[PDB]
Amino acid sequence: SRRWFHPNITGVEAENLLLTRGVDGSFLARPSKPGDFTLSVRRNGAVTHIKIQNTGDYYDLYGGEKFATLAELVQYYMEHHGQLKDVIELKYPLNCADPTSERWFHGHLEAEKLLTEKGKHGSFLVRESPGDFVLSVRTGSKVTHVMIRCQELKYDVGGGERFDSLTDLVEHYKKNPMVETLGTVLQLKQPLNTTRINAAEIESRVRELSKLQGFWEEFETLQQQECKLLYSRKEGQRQENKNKNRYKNILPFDHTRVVLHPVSDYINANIIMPKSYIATQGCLQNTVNDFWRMVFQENSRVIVMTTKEVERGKSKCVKYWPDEYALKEYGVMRVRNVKESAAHDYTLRELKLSKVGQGNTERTVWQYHFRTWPDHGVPSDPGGVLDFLEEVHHKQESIMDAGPVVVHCSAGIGRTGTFIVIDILIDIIREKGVDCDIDVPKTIQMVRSQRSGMVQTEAQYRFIYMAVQHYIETL
Ligand SMILES: O=C(O)c1ccc(O)c(-c2nnc3n(Cc4ccccc4Cl)c(=O)c4ccccc4n23)c1
Ligand SMILES: CC1(N)CCN(c2cnc(-c3cccc(Cl)c3Cl)c(N)n2)CC1
Known part of the structure; x- marks a missing residue:
């Protein structure tokens, strides 16, 4: 997973996220507020910001090495301790709940036109309903709409479990498909x-x-x-x-x-x-x-x-x-x-x-x-x-x-x-x-x-x- 990457946050938001919801060894990556990146790590009760530069050849980490992707960079430093420095350790990813970089998330959406034209069996999408969301799936052929209630920072389909993000809900119903009364399996095969x-x-x-x-x-x-x-x-x-x-x-x-x-x-x-x-x-x-x-x-x-x-x-x-x-x-x-x-x-x-x-x-x-x-x-x-x-x-x-x-x-x-x-x-x-x-x-x-x-x-x-x-x- 790549949950440690937050696309819509500032350095202050990152600092407050890491201080209140992280521990020593907690980390996240984020785009620079442009074309550059920041790796924010919690070490001995304080947050340290490390610059990552990309001009088009490789990801260049300040005080570290050159990598082909941010995922390869994180995978390496989580496996090779002492390589980042006063040594800085990447122990715990601090997960992002924002659905903007998900293939299936289409904010304001129309969705039936797209699913009828482009979609196939198992083609799904998620859109913004007030403050609630809609999961629209194609099966066959027909399109089914599932309402997603956002109640006190948690997401649910009207019963059972309450998820901390739309991603957690989507992934859960991907592995455990919702079955309609008359037997239609709401298979979320591909976005x-x-x-x-x-x-x-x-x-x-x-x-x-x-x-x-x-x-x-x-x-x-x-x-x-x-x-x-x-x-x-x-x-x-x-x-x-x-x-x-x-x-x-x-x-x-x-x-x-x-x-x-x-x-x-x-x-x-x-x-x-x-x-x-x-x-x-x-x-x-x-x-x-x-x-x-x-x-x-x-x-x-x-x-x-x-x-x-x-x-x-x-x-x-x-x-x-x-x-x-x-x-x-x-x-x-x-x-x-x-x-x-x-x-x-x-x-x-x-x-x-x-x-x-x-x-x-x-x-x-x-x-x-x-x-x-x-x-x-x-x-x-x-x-x-x-x-x-x-x-x-x-x-x-x-x-x-x-x-x-x-x-x-x-x-x-x-x-x-x-x-x-x-x-x-x-x-x-x-x-x-x-x-x-x-x-x-x-x-x-x-x-x-x-x-x-x-x-x-x-x-x-x-x-x-x-x-x-x-x-x-x-x-
Ligand atoms: O053995 C396998 O089947 C297998 C399967 C998937 C993989 O990703 C890899 C693997 N290949 N390279 C890597 N590196 C990079 C690395 C290590 C040493 C020196 C320079 C570089 Cl740049 C990792 O840090 C790495 C970390 C955890 C887990 C696998 C890793 N991994 C191996
Ligand atoms: C608003 C939104 N969140 C941003 C744009 N968007 C999408 C969708 N799908 C891809 C895609 C297509 C083929 C292969 C790969 Cl790997 C990817 Cl990821 C893509 N790059 N962006 C739609 C949702």
Whole structure:
């Protein structure tokens, strides 16, 4: 669960919540009053606020480490005591009762129209009735409305138990379905889908999401679902693999990691299946050889670099390619940089990859280096990114039996997830045309189960909508 995250509270509300309802070791996370986060912890009768920064690459904790998600951050510190500091301990989550980041909560709602149009057997939603709530379910086919009485800070369906939150009530009736007199089981199988749009109606959705914003609420609801993606990252934790990670706590899921054929099988990279991708971190001096072994083994012919080598005076990715016209050996792999072409937003490098001692293994690898992405945030216009993805897509499509496209930035989750998701969404619109259904958070949740924290910020999330809108507008 992710109940420790409170989306609509202030620092004072957090302090009073922790002092009156928590104990020593009580904690909560919250958005900054913007784009930053606060971890508030009770220690020796007093509340300590710790800043968490995300500019689009990773969650950066003051006095701690860098993480792919807030859930991974909390999971780590709740398991590894002494790592946060005077040591600060995360013992007890202080649960949030606010239903705003729940998939099924639709405040003011109409609900019968949505359930009849979009719904199926077990599709449900919760809405605001005075101060009371309504649970509306579809079964088959028909729609049933259950009143939810709010009586003295507690919620109930007219009898039995009284829950401290709508979430507790929903979860209880999810596991224990209400049975109507004549036998209809009020199965709450899945929340009603309200995010799937028809591609031709994107400008309408972007307009509604821009109203007081809706983009923030939709993104935080997606963030609440990240607690279901805490898959094992054991291989990245091995002693022999620690120095192969750019960030010690940003690791690849074992079940999707690229396996390389003493301990020569590891790279911090994952296969992303929607044309497949490999999402990876920027090379380290000690991982350049593992990087070319991955490119060669996977039969990849296109590499997308979405970062400069150095940003804000800090190394983001080492130069893993030779200078123009030069030849270099990276272990068993040989790379020639044949030609470099400069365009406004990017540089194209035509590389020739082969295994040393075997000439017939040679293939051209096209490296598309996007150089104009800002240090913080996202571009103000998606046209540059869209023209770039269009060219990358056409190169990939022209090469018979080409392997997955290699995509990397620094940690390989923010800008990498953003470029991949845009590329997945636009591909549906290429194959199926303007008359197709696209579901942005569904696409992201799917990519995120293949690599942690793919798409880092709300600014990137909004950029994905703007990019899809722009692609459809130029169709
Ligand atoms: O063994 C399994 O089947 C299994 C299943 C689900 C999982 O989430 C994991 C697991 N994978 N990584 C982690 N980390 C991260 C970590 C540990 C050490 C060094 C760096 C990093 Cl960044 C956790 O802190 C963690 C904490 C509690 C419970 C599982 C955890 N876990 C393993
Ligand atoms: C007002 C509200 N609380 C905010 C927006 N909203 C929703 C609903 N569903 C998703 C969704 C869709 C597909 C996959 C995933 Cl994981 C998610 Cl979470 C979403 N992001 N927002 C509706 C309720």
